[model samples]
Target chain A: PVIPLDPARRPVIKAQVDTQTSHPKTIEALLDTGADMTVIPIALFSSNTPLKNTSVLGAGGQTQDHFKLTSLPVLIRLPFRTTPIVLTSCLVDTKNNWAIIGRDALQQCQGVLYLP
Target chain B: PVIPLDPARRPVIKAQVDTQTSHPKTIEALLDTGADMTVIPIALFSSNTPLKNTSVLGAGGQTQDHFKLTSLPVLIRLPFRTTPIVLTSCLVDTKNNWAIIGRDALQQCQGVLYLP
Candidate 1:
């Protein structure tokens, strides 16, 4: 079934990230319009698990590869609906408040979002 | 087009709000699995646009009607892909880093999310 889009059709997402694990390795990322996919910090992956090897560009345009989305199950929340949308993980180097909702999710509805 | 789910198919979303205009009313929200729908705070509405009267359940379970999703255009960013997904606005009374991705978005894909 096609989910009806609101006249405004702007879904607000209230997401929380848990950086508190046995490794206590957590970082914060933002949802950005600039990115094309969700990013997982390489640092967090190694801190938690050592099953993946990945790399991403850093602020200084340097390549970093200590973390990656370990092909694991990641949890996310949606405020409008009662359930969660789970998907695969990505590997990255740092945590920002930016999660990515690329063309994949956009194919379902309409509207625009600007990341802070 | 069926967006392929990564064996680790979790997508990241980076969202931003443009409250900069004659009214300068911008707020930030997160994508949450804990919530069933998207939430918008009441205070920010009055700061920018005149929204319709709406109410929602509060922390104390009190009925409040000062904020809501004004049914506006919200923009989002997704990594991995080179596009943005936009949805509808929800009327809320406060601002937080939680944007709920409920059954609607989940129906499009598969996975789990845990809210902090």
Candidate 2:
């Protein structure tokens, strides 16, 4: 099934990110195919998880360094699917909001954008 | 042919925008489904274009105002399509660089992002 695109405003989706503990955090993520990788807030992690340092370049050639954590538990609650789809290898940062669902996660769900 | 997703970096595409005269400007636009409307550089316009005042909210509850212009001529060259698709109703602003291709344009072409 195709996810309906909002006619009036941007299409924002709800996703779930979990930590090592029992509590799971649900956040509103902007579905951005333009973004190469999924971005999450650093607070989502419980402890200092192992991460590789990298930099991301945004519009106007601005670059910011970030931590890359692979195979993290990120789930998207789509009405089309019975179970939430897991997105792996997300880039976590303190500056980002709840999360920005990028191409890396969109591919996992084989997501398609319908603009009508 | 499906437009190949860049394995190493963010997938950036080139697009063209035209004015009343013979001059047509081309720039790189990030394919963002999260954005409700297409955004362009105000410098692309020759003179002051008819614009409506609007506001946009970004990550971390940051809000910014912008000018909304409707039915502006824009084009994107895709590998699968024979000719470039014309994207209109793009919001223009001075603070941005190049353009941001949002859901409005993607819906026009029925775009699908393939991440491998």
Candidate 3:
């Protein structure tokens, strides 16, 4: 179930998801509001995966990481929307402990989450 | 300057950038094509920064993290366009790496990229 965001402000949300697009196995992750961009674990997508060229601005706003981003047409079926949302997965936060869901994806779906 | 993607399917590209909206300082990032979502280093925005609730699916697709995401109206000016794009910063890949740009932002501005 989704815990609605304060109506006055943009919604902050979380959910338990099993992302099977990039990875052979499913890994757990937290939906981070602190994360501006949606990040997938590198293990989910590899060098062999379709890669695009792009640059990222670090949190500190000084360093950048270059990569060939990848996308998979995913179907995120939620209660709010009956149709699936086609979203590409980028290998952001390659070294982090977990991946992140940014505003780009968050805007697509709004609600809160709790995982087991 | 950007090295274009092989003109077969989707264009893989690269570019140099200065992300100034999320942090007090501007950070240089690679803007990866391999990335599915946009990622900002955790340091860019802080607890004090505006945050929204969200969920992230890890590379493994099992673990989940929860937090609030933040957005800022940023102008990613390049040789192609002069308008400003409103983007938020997310704390992704919090460890062992720079930040990343995901498909969410890349598709918004299609093409390639290269950083110095």
Candidate 4:
């Protein structure tokens, strides 16, 4: 899918996700080319999970309190793709309702930004 | 230019820019589709320039001290293109050396994220 980057609108796609601790569920995801790693909602994983603290850089500059690193892998299946993309580790948003597909997942799907 | 989205690497492009209050200079800019607006380094603008305070969302929950809005339009020239892209308003990095070309500029240049 070719997503035209627009300032007025966000580019999004559906993804089937599994957090190991939770059942697999299909959800809408933000296609974020700016992010280095994927971000999942903290609600998707167990609250008592032994996750690691992490810092991420973005609109509000670098901060560590808003997100955490998962200890286990996060599985993702993109639209029309039979094979799922497995992430060794990724971020989990603790504050906002963020379900972002960053470069980590985009690279596996051969997604790229093109300009002519 | 086609930039492969990779977690290990960042996509960037050089742009000839003029902030109205500063001299025109070519600077390397990050290709960030996650951002709603473009971001220029505050150092590019004059110290006495009038800029509006703004808040942004990211790793941190939400903060207003890291960035500001330009009162004057910012001009940009991409590679191989004689004509420039004019931005009515954009963000200015107050804490970091961030020169990002977000969707506002990307849309003008027809740059898009493609996942096949």
lDDT of each candidate versus the true structure: 0.38, 0.60, 0.42, 0.88
What is each candidate's DockQ, to 2 decimals?
0.03, 0.25, 0.03, 0.79
| Candidate 4 per-residue lDDT over residues B52-88, each given as its tens digit | 9978766667776888899999999998698899999
Per-residue lDDT for A62-87 in model 1, tens only? 24443344456554344444344444
Tell how far residue B35 is off in model 4, in angstroms: 0.6
Per-residue lDDT of candidate 3, residues B1-116 (tens digit): 33322212222223233344343444455433334455555555454555555655333232234333555543344345555433545434444355454545554564322211
TM-score of each: 0.32, 0.61, 0.35, 0.95
Question: What is residue B40's positional error in candidate 3, in angstroms?
Answer: 0.7
Model 1 spans with C-alpha error above 4 angstroms: A1-116, B1-14, B18-28, B40-48, B79-81, B94-116
Q: iRMS of every model, one decimal?
A: 14.8, 5.1, 16.8, 1.3
- Cα displacement (angstroms), candidate 1, residue B87, comes to 1.8
Interface RMSD of 4: 1.3
**Per-residue alpha-carbon lDDT of model 2 for A1-116, expressed as tens digits?**
44444335656677776644336777777677677777877777756565656666453334445445644466555434546656656677655544777777676675644322
Model 4, residue B79: C-alpha shift (Å): 1.0
Q: What is candidate 1's lDDT per residue for B1-116, written digit by digit as tens?
A: 13223222333344443322234333444433323445534443445565566664332233444345555654433333344344455444454323444333332233232222
Backbone clash pairs in model 3 (N, Cα, C under 3 Å; residues 3+ apart or in different chains), count: 83
**DockQ pick, better of 3 and 4:** 4
Clashes of each: 115, 2, 83, 0
C-alpha lDDT of candidate 3 relative to the true structure: 0.42
Using TM-score as the measure, name the better of candidate 3 and candidate 4. Answer: 4
